[PDB]
A paper describes a structure:
[name] is a critical pre-[name] splicing factor for the early stage of spliceosome assembly at the major class of 3′ splice sites. Two central RNA recognition motifs (RRM1 and RRM2) recognize a polypyrimidine consensus sequence (Py tract) composed primarily of uridines and at lower frequencies, cytidines. Structures of the [name] RNA binding domain show an “open”, side-by-side conformation of the RRMs binds to uridine-rich Py tracts. Considering that the NDD-affected residues are located near the RNA interface of [name] structures, here we investigated the hypothesis that disrupted [name]–RNA interactions could contribute to altered pre-[name] splicing by the recurrent NDD-associated variants. De novo mutations affecting the pre-[name] splicing factor [name] are associated with developmental delays and intellectual disabilities, yet the molecular basis is unknown. To address this question, we determined the X-ray crystal structures of Arg149Trp- and Arg150His-substituted U2AF212L bound to Py tract oligonucleotides at 1.4 Å resolutions.
The Arg149Trp, Arg150His, and Arg150Cys substitutions decreased the apparent binding affinity of U2AF212L for this consensus site by approximately three-, four-, and five-fold. The sequence of the cocrystallized Py tract (5′-phosphoryl-UU(dU)U(5Br-dU)CC-3′) corresponds to a 3′ splice site of the AdML transcript, a well-characterized substrate for in vitro pre-[name] splicing (e.g.,9,16). For the Arg149Trp U2AF212L variant, the bulky tryptophan disordered four N-terminal residues of U2AF212L as well as the Arg146 side chain, which lacked detectable electron density at 1σ contour level. Although the WT Arg149 did not contact the bound oligonucleotide, the nearby Arg146 side chain interacted with the terminal pyrimidine-O2 atom. In the Arg149Trp mutant structure, the Gln147 side chain flips to replace the former Arg146–nucleobase hydrogen bond. Neither of the amino acid substitutions significantly perturbed the other site–i.e., Arg149Trp has little effect on Arg150, and Arg150His had little effect on Arg149. Instead, the NDD-associated substitutions converged on disrupting Arg146 interactions with the terminal nucleotide of the cocrystallized Py tract. The effects of the variants on [name] – RNA interactions are unlikely to be sequence-specific, since Arg146 interacts similarly with either uridine or cytidine. Unlike WT, the Arg149Trp, Arg150Cys, or Arg150His [name] variants are unable to detectably promote splicing of a minigene transcript in HEK293T cells.
Author numbering: 145 to 340
Amino acid sequence: TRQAWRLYVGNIPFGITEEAMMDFFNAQMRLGGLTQAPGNPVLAVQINQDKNFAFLEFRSVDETTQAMAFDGIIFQGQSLKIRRPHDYQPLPGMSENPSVYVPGVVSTVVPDSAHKLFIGGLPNYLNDDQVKELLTSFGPLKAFNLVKDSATGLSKGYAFCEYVDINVTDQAIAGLNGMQLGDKKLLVQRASVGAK
Ligand code: NA
Ligand code: NA
């Protein structure tokens, strides 16, 4: 099954070409020490421009798995969402999880948990990178996602995150909750408090 050689990439920059995406991933894999031989690990990229996602095709199962470590990497201001194809199943005795860490890359997977934060009231002109930088001021992030409209790509003005250090959570709340920005006022609280 070809699905062990392919990844979904969501939240791609508008107007990006398949070649630009391929060059980005091939370079990052090499610069990060993930590539396992001479030559390019990514063989092809198929972009769905209207739906805002791509699929990457890799030359090996192992390099496909390692590339999962790039989930959340910023590309032209956007956090790339890297995921397995929905019809992927690991073969027995194979780990589906990457074994290398990429410095500075913050996962987009923010599970509901004790210290998961909601940040509402963000100006909609801030991209994923700038909201991430706002939050990183308080301490390193374990995970982060800025919510966007799936049809237009515009920020919906709220995000979720998890700090590496659970104790930074209350520091970010103290520094950001109630902050006024024009007509908006930030609400920063554990996401469990106001989850619908
Ligand atoms: Na879309
Ligand atoms: Na988007």
